[PDB]
Amino acid sequence: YFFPKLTAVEALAPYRLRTTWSTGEVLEVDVGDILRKIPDLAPILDPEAFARVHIAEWEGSVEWFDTEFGRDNVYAWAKEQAGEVSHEMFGDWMHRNNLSLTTAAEALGISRRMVSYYRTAHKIIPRTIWLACLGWEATRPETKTLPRTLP
Template structure:
């Protein structure tokens, strides 16, 4: 994936509050915004189908704009949402996991058994996150291993609660 993988080259409004997004790296995604439009005050104006149909590529391909400087959505967030809606794992999950665990990039890469560079690719959305890597993140969170030794079983509910105090 190129470093411009969040640069939008085209947007097409589709029926039922969906968008078709084409990015500079050649990838095309469809994203359904209906739930967000009907649950968010900020996006409420987009309930008007005529306004929604006016979606256009924003400044430098970094947003989808409806009303310039008033109503737009970032292309990185839209891509993340589209990936998640298609059953993939969006890169923001890695950002959140790193933040929640407090691990450095080096520690996290070692915990997952991958290189620091590969973790950065996943974190920055430059490569798709394999299901096995996301499952490893969830597994690490569940057991919080100490050092290099891995547990031989998943913790019980009580053990898990002890590892994750409120």
């Protein structure tokens, strides 16, 4: 799952969006690259159709014609474009290392609850935690204790 709720979206100058969330966050995000990448999204490149952006009823997604972008993906891209670590980066770290909430928690030295919060975007990911994720990847396998230097 994904914790934040989208409460507003507004089109700026193509192809930038302003998104407002239940967390009180107001985040901007450029969706130009994805609209140019995916052929099916071509009608949205027309500046009059782009301006038509709204929240979809059922799904809480960013929509022009039909639920184009899940709110979770939009939230991650905004974090990433802003130079922060997104819940998707954290999820990718877990998936590529075949970690559960439990083994991720043990990997990082934090609680299971905290791992869940990071993966669900319930809590923003500190720089410290992402450095730890990479540090953990750089020190595999699990030795008896952590090394004094990088291998």
